[PDB]
């Protein structure tokens, strides 16, 4: 409970490291994630410390009592992290080693503009309660920086884990102490999205395109409208895992293009039937033969252009 | 814990400002929203203060102990805000500067009568626990009024942030102290709603309108009824993000008009087939040619009238 | 903490009033509702009071300390109400005025037998912890009875607010103290339910009824079965806001009648086709012409009878 | 806080009774239920009691302080029950009467093998913290056993309420004290399930069976496959209230039988068309006439056998 | 509160056992599970113990006060377990026996690659707060190891319950104490999944395969596309209980194969109609007769290969 000793007149640089233990519940649509980890705090001090004179009499005279505990808080947590003290340790320089285990919810924005093939970057910020009898500074230990015990996140490939200090810039003077930025880069495992979402949609569209080899108006109308119904049903099927998104997405563009193709093919069928009724068979045949080679080429080209737009 | 000093006999005007840090979870259908922010309290006092005689001996003799803390509460919160003290500061006039970080849920009504192109106004009210040894008054600092650190809300354009005092009017005398009103104006980003909701519905309706170029009764019946089924399915698809609304809405009117158009087109098809069977071909042809130009014009006109009704 | 003074040997009649501030979250299917309100407690006493001798020396010698606080509890709350003391006041008769703000969940049964045009009655019960050194009695102040600050509940018309005392009848002697009954009458705003639920169902049924003007068996079968499919889809669409109900409802009866009508019209179509095949054209024609005028009249009559059954 | 007096060397038999006040939220699929009730504890004692010598001087010298409170806990509650002390009372034999109000969640397994016509049996178990200075025994008072104040549970008929003591059999010696078993028998009100679930399914199946009076292959195929689609849609409609069940159910069997009937009728239609094409009209006609009387009889017989299997 | 006595200089081996009482709420898609159980802690000690000299004077001098309580924590729990002390007991060697009841949520990963016929293995880890005045060691009692009181988990067959110690390997020295691993093996009861999911899908596919016995293009197109729609609807019906899975699954493969078969059968129907129109009847007939025997054989073979891939 004693104040930090200002004998050097130099800011108390504090070195800290967060050690991940288990990361689950990446609720995409909600933009949060559960985190269980080990928070390692270890500060340096000179006065009210002890030089090596105890030696074997007292190899490490540990203090159970809470002394000079640097009050650090997350800035992106609705509710303060869980507290569970594990162990304490002192160095022959008087520097205390503290360990704790906690469970938190962190609010980090997610960007789904390339939903199936996207890479996120989860953020955690650290702030320190700055004292008046001395100046405090947060630093990150390069070792102890953070590791995951070879944990795995379901459907994500963890890529790095990096700490970096940065000014608060919170427009408050006593709130200008530099904050810690814990960056966790992840990449989605996209393989199963192909056979689970992409291929059946193309299958339904290809099934509807068969009407360009048929002359029967009734059969063509049934094909195209029933395939539109199947498309809408399949969209209802796959929206359950798609997060709620008020901006343009790769997959949303693809869906819009598919609706537009359905409209254009109903138009083609109607024009062919009208021309046949008004007795222009050569013209009907030419339009349908043209459509045969024209629909898939234009679908391919539009997809290439969409992909070069969304993926650089 | 001491009482405010009544040496001026003049109400203790208290100046306060809420600083936004992160606003998320605008649950539309629920009419609440999560808020994380910094609450800055700073009152003035004359007695039990200190004039500048300490000077360099004590540039700012800060009081860790809680003195003259004005108990302020939100009036529109189910549960009291989180408490996390950050820092304290004193002025050479004895005026204390207090900062805190909190996380709250605020109950604000939302009006979705122009759902895709609407603008909301989130409200936060402040009340003060009024003491008996002195009179207290809440004021808002024009500076420190509130800022968002350039935060962004997903799918919303933040427009202003304004504080304004107003009488409680809570029909209770000791509850007549003027309250603070924090107004946050937002505007929805409507672009993606167009290709996500509006266009495919029109596409299905236009697809159903093709039956006015066909004579086959069976094909016409399949077209119109299958397109009605597709409309109902698409409504099931898009209701998931539409909030539960017990009043008339722009989009609800549009949906009702589309159901009515489907009914009228089944009627047209039936009348054409009946006239053809009863051998009035000229009349059948005239009705269908009329319908060709009559359905889209009436749809356009009704939409113009609906929009001039809902948007002034 | 002192016991009530038994100097009159007469029960301590306590007068109380609940003042509504904000009522939201009327979760119909769950039969609860959030309530934020002001609870005003004010008891009378003679001993350990003070007559008007202080006068201007002490116009109102208020007691911050908690004295003779009547412990009152709700009986229909899963978890005790929130506590937030606001202010205290004393009368020159020694009678204390207490105010508080709270947030509660109240369990009240809802009766949806006339779902679109129903009127509910939310209930709140008050009980008092009865002491042994004196007798306590709960009364309600006619003024201060309760008001809503002109609050509005979304989709409901608030009608009255009435307090009434009634015996507990809880089969326990020390639990026989009369309880307070706070009754809040509300009426649903039914207008938007018409164009949102009722009309499209009738539209689909009328669309299916067109088969009585057609001779083609294939077209008739498509009409009637596709309209049945559309009915089921629309039911899936509108069940999302309908509360889970294990008893007969007006709307449930209507839905059952519509299923039955669909069955009877498939039967009519089949009988007409069978008679035509077996070469009884006059009889087929007579049955279909009869059905033309017979289906809507019987629908109208059944609806009148259903409504006189459910609405007196 | 004093220990029970061992003057008789005989176990302290404790008599208790739970009085129901409000039972709601029977979440079927979750196998829990909310309970609000009054718990009445009343133990007997001889030493540190008082014989009738006070008389009118002290008709009942009540102890506000907590003395000899038997610590009883539920064994089937995730979280301990709510605590709200109401009143206390002493008998001229020194036996204390205690009352409390609580709100709990009880984990009781539900058996849905006869879902529409099933009867459940909710269970509540009581355990007592057994002391070392004396032996304690839990008994149930036949009067005070428990009543419901004529409460009603929505969609359930409450049948009895019975207490019964039974050995723990928890394989722990200090955990061998006999436990109390509170049994609440309920029966479902099945009437509305008939017109809400059962009849429309039969209506769709009967509608599909009409194809045995038609010769047109196209119309027969449309009838049967569209009715299959309607069946699947109606199943989606009614699964919302059906609890998640990993075992065989009466209704699940019925649904499986209906799918099988649909398969067999597509087979019948295909065989009739094949025989007609291969020019065996007598045989086609004989098969279809046979199917006419064979499908409903076999449906009836299978239903009788299913019901005698599931309902003894 | 006293420190463990270091008179042997030998680590304090502590023996513990978890006794299951009720296991429910195996939320598959969430990878957690509720657990209610009895935790039995019993350590050995020599100093500050008592040899058998009390005898009948004090058969077991029990200590109500908390002495030498080994602080043990779960490592895979978001929030610490519930605490409810039941009883305490001492041995004539001074070894204390402790019992407690708790309610926890345990985070264990689930592997659904063989979803209908899979076997899980729920894990619980134990850690011990290691003290500085002595060395502590966690051991598991072979008896008292854990039992379930013949509890049953709905839809799962409990198979074993085994304890095993293992090094932490948490990369922290003071965190290197060996941890306990409680392994609970379960197997799913798959019977009802057959008639509930597997058979109706095959029924719809077999229904679509009938088009290889028909020549009518319109009827064939209706069969195949309506059966595709029914497949999508049935998938919507059965996804509600299937957990969200970002990897390949047996059932997901089966669904993909069924979509592919639907595509190939639309292709077959189109090619037959094209050849008939272009007047190659022998070739059309040969292709359709080939398809008759070729579709089911290839379905069978692909299923065998899929099953030998997913089940060794
Ligand atoms: C005789 C034949 C008749 C043909 C009739 C054609 C139909 C008429 C209507 C056509 C509508 C065409 C699009 C209308 C505007 C919709 C905009 C749109 O599709 O954009 C979505 C998307 C791209 O979004 P970005 O702008 O890249 O998103 C990032 C920036 N926020 O575009 C597409 O989906 C293109 C599809 C082709
Ligand atoms: C908007 C409402 C859309 C309703 C349906 C519009 C298309 C109906 C089909 C028109 C048709 O068959 O026209 C045949 C017609 C016959 O020509 P003759 O004078 O005989 O030479 O041919 C054409 O017009 C050629 C095709 C071009 C017209 C295509 C129209 C597409 C409309 C898109 C509107 C987008 C909004
Ligand atoms: C031979 C041809 C036969 C034609 C038969 C026509 C169908 C017969 C039935 C027609 C029903 C017409 C509407 C009936 C009442 C429905 C009211 C309605 O639609 O109102 C919704 C809405 C407007 O609501 P407001 O009043 O502006 O909302 C703000 C105030 N609360 O109106 C529309 O949707 C108009 C659509 C045209
Ligand atoms: C309500 C129930 C609605 C069922 C369907 C109603 C419409 C069926 C079609 C009527 C039809 O074909 O009539 C043809 C008939 C033949 O006339 P002749 O005597 O031969 O000269 O022509 C007409 O009646 C002209 C069209 C006007 C009738 C339209 C009726 C619309 C009814 C809307 C009801 C809204 C509620
Ligand atoms: C040749 C033509 C063949 C015709 C065949 C007809 C179909 C045969 C089956 C008919 C079933 C008729 C109803 C069977 C019992 C269903 C009961 C029922 O519908 O009741 C619901 C409801 C009324 O409920 P109440 O009793 O008023 O509710 C309050 C009391 N709890 O009734 C209706 O929906 C009536 C609809 C007409
Ligand atoms: C129950 C299973 C229902 C399957 C379908 C039943 C109805 C099929 C249609 C019967 C049909 O077309 O009968 C024609 C038949 C031909 O008569 P002839 O002997 O030629 O003079 O006419 C009739 O039978 C007249 C109509 C009355 C029969 C209606 C039967 C309705 C059955 C409802 C069952 C409810 C359960
Ligand atoms: C030429 C005509 C071709 C006919 C082809 C017929 C289809 C071939 C496949 C038929 C599958 C028959 C059932 C296969 C096994 C499914 C088991 C099954 O249905 O059981 C469910 C259920 C009964 O479950 P219990 O065993 O009583 O449940 C309590 C014990 N746990 O049975 C039924 O649904 C019977 C339906 C007839
Ligand atoms: C003239 C006839 C025209 C025929 C046209 C055929 C359609 C053309 C497209 C065919 C697509 C074929 C598959 C494409 C890649 C999809 C991959 C795929 O299906 O894999 C899923 C699955 C197996 O996954 P594993 O790799 O075993 O999973 C464990 C390892 N993570 O494979 C299948 O479903 C096989 C189905 C046959
Ligand atoms: C991709 C877009 C798919 C659209 C539909 C493709 C198939 C249409 C049917 C083709 C057809 O009928 O061809 C008949 C044609 C007539 O031959 P002649 O020259 O008369 O001898 O026969 C054939 O081509 C034999 C069948 C082989 C073609 C099958 C094509 C399958 C395409 C799969 C694409 C997968 C992506």
GROMACS .gro file of C-alpha atoms and ligand atoms in nm, chain A residues 248 252-254 256-257 260 263-264 267 302 306 309-310, chain B residues 191 194-195 199 203, ligand 1:
model
   56
  248UNK     CA    1  -2.149  -0.503  -4.950
  252UNK     CA    2  -2.392  -1.086  -5.133
  253UNK     CA    3  -2.277  -0.960  -5.472
  254UNK     CA    4  -2.276  -1.317  -5.603
  256UNK     CA    5  -2.749  -1.050  -5.643
  257UNK     CA    6  -2.589  -1.151  -5.973
  260UNK     CA    7  -3.035  -1.096  -6.203
  263UNK     CA    8  -3.464  -1.252  -6.437
  264UNK     CA    9  -3.277  -1.238  -6.767
  267UNK     CA   10  -3.700  -1.275  -7.029
  302UNK     CA   11  -1.876  -1.119  -6.432
  306UNK     CA   12  -1.622  -0.933  -5.912
  309UNK     CA   13  -1.281  -0.607  -5.740
  310UNK     CA   14  -1.307  -0.766  -5.395
  503UNK     CA   15  -2.708   0.144  -4.979
  506UNK     CA   16  -3.128  -0.184  -5.214
  507UNK     CA   17  -2.951  -0.488  -5.372
  511UNK     CA   18  -3.438  -0.543  -5.622
  515UNK     CA   19  -3.752  -0.904  -6.002
 1561LIG     C1   20  -3.372  -0.688  -7.219
 1561LIG     C2   21  -3.293  -0.728  -7.095
 1561LIG     C3   22  -3.338  -0.652  -6.970
 1561LIG     C4   23  -3.228  -0.640  -6.866
 1561LIG     C5   24  -3.273  -0.571  -6.738
 1561LIG     C6   25  -3.163  -0.566  -6.632
 1561LIG     C7   26  -3.215  -0.539  -6.491
 1561LIG     C8   27  -3.229  -0.390  -6.460
 1561LIG     C9   28  -3.178  -0.351  -6.322
 1561LIG    C10   29  -3.029  -0.378  -6.306
 1561LIG    C11   30  -2.971  -0.336  -6.172
 1561LIG    C12   31  -2.819  -0.325  -6.176
 1561LIG    C13   32  -2.754  -0.285  -6.044
 1561LIG    C14   33  -2.828  -0.170  -5.976
 1561LIG    C15   34  -2.755  -0.111  -5.856
 1561LIG    C16   35  -2.711  -0.219  -5.758
 1561LIG    C17   36  -2.568  -0.202  -5.710
 1561LIG    C18   37  -2.496  -0.334  -5.700
 1561LIG     O1   38  -2.533  -0.435  -5.752
 1561LIG     O2   39  -2.386  -0.325  -5.626
 1561LIG    C19   40  -2.343  -0.442  -5.557
 1561LIG    C20   41  -2.224  -0.505  -5.625
 1561LIG    C21   42  -2.089  -0.439  -5.599
 1561LIG     O3   43  -2.085  -0.359  -5.482
 1561LIG     P1   44  -1.960  -0.254  -5.473
 1561LIG     O4   45  -2.002  -0.116  -5.513
 1561LIG     O5   46  -1.838  -0.314  -5.535
 1561LIG     O6   47  -1.947  -0.264  -5.308
 1561LIG    C22   48  -1.839  -0.197  -5.248
 1561LIG    C23   49  -1.876  -0.052  -5.227
 1561LIG     N1   50  -1.975  -0.036  -5.117
 1561LIG     O7   51  -2.252  -0.513  -5.765
 1561LIG    C24   52  -2.298  -0.627  -5.816
 1561LIG     O8   53  -2.350  -0.713  -5.749
 1561LIG    C25   54  -2.279  -0.635  -5.965
 1561LIG    C26   55  -2.358  -0.749  -6.028
 1561LIG    C27   56  -2.348  -0.750  -6.180
   0.00000   0.00000   0.00000
